[PDB]
Amino acid sequence: GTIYPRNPAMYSEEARLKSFQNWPDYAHLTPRELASAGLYYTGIGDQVQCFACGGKLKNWEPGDRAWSEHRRHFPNCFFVLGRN
């Protein structure tokens, strides 16, 4: 159809969750919260990627939420625009 995920593999929330196997211990956000926001781990530092838009984010900050960082950086993401 008319939209297409940048990474079809990470379409599943479960698969996004498992990508956080080696999420570093200084990274305060939970794999649960990140995966639920469409994000999976790139395997580099604290850098994550959206399956849908392909946007990438790093250097998470105390008080950051995955959804709001996702939305504010990539507002036109179909995953962002499809949630509730």
Partner: peptide
């Protein structure tokens, strides 16, 4: 967070 910031863009890469």
């Amino acid at each position: 967070a910031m863009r890469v």
